[PDB]
């Protein structure tokens, strides 16, 4: 199906405790493949997936160099942002960036991404046209003006439509045995008496990849959206994910409830009962 590559940058200032720490991680879909940490004894872009290891020294040297430059640029940005908001040098602040590309089954660019957040709030984003910006406030407008004058959007467009998609395609091929393999959820229902009057039915999905999944409870064929407890999808630690959905049911009425599971690893959606 469709695929994505994403880089996630986080820089956090820490007045009195050195310069802002820069962390970078790279993902293809739900699989991390690289990491960089400016606090590391010897900061280097490092492999986090088996299929990226085959890349040569030039790859690792070039990407390390880019990460080191980005470490410095983020520190400049943090200084600028502090000023844009009239903030003191005493506080700690966070700058986040995510960027990358989405491709369809034919490897064609679907969409490009490039956006930033400051202290957890959206700050500025490259629009889907890859040619204009959306600024959240008057501070981000300053950034926008700078980047328009420097024609940053055009440079990003070139990267997103070229380099980004080319690397994603390469990664998808080199790691095809995993990246292009959907692992279906292993599903079952458990029953947990609460009292004489009711019990919990919990629908489980385990060992699935990618993370995207839909679990729903129906009663008499009606979705129980408002009455269903859904936990956040969580990593098992072996590349796969887990999730459950639970409803509280009247004792003896269990058979009126059905769990429905959708996942790209499944030919047809599953229906489960206690």
């Amino acid at each position: 199906g469709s695929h994505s590559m994403r880089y996630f940058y986080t820089s956090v200032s820490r007045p009195g405790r050195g310069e802002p720490r820069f962390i970078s991680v790279g993902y293809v879909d739900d699989t991390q493949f690289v990491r960089f940490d400016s606090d590391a004894a010897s900061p280097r872009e490092e492999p986090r997936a088996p299929w990226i290891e085959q890349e040569g020294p030039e790859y690792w040297d070039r990407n390390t160099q880019i990460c080191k430059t980005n470490t410095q640029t983020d520190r400049e940005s943090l200084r600028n942002l502090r000023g844009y908001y009239n903030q003191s040098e005493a506080g700690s602040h966070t700058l986040q960036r995510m960027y990358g590309c989405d491709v369809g089954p034919d490897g064609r660019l679907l969409r490009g991404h490039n956006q930033f957040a400051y202290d957890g709030k959206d700050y500025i984003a490259l629009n889907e046209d890859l040619s204009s910006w959306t600024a959240a406030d008057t501070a981000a407008q300053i950034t926008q003006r700078k980047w328009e004058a420097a024609r940053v959007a055009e440079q990003l467009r070139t990267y997103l439509e070229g380099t980004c998609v080319e690397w994603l395609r390469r990664y998808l091929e080199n790691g095809k045995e995993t990246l292009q393999r959907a692992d279906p959820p292993k599903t079952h229902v458990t029953h947990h008496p609460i009292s004489d009057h009711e019990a919990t039915l919990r629908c489980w999905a385990l060992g699935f990849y990618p993370a995207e999944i839909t679990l729903t409870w129906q009663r008499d064929g009606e979705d129980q959206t408002q009455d269903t407890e859904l936990v956040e999808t969580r990593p098992a630690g072996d590349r796969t994910f887990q999730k459950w959905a639970a409803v509280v049911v009247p004792s003896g009425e269990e058979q009126r409830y059905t769990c429905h599971v959708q996942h790209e690893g499944l030919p047809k959606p599953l229906t489960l009962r206690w």
Binding site: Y7, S24, G26, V34, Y59, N63, I66, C67, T69, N70, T73, E76, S77, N80, L81, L95, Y99, F116, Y123, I124, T143, K146, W147, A150, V152, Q155, L156, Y159, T163, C164, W167
Partner: peptide, 9 residues
């Protein structure tokens, strides 16, 4: 693989 465009906010 990373973008090589260098522009501070």
């Amino acid at each position: 693989s990373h973008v090589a465009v260098e522009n501070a906010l």
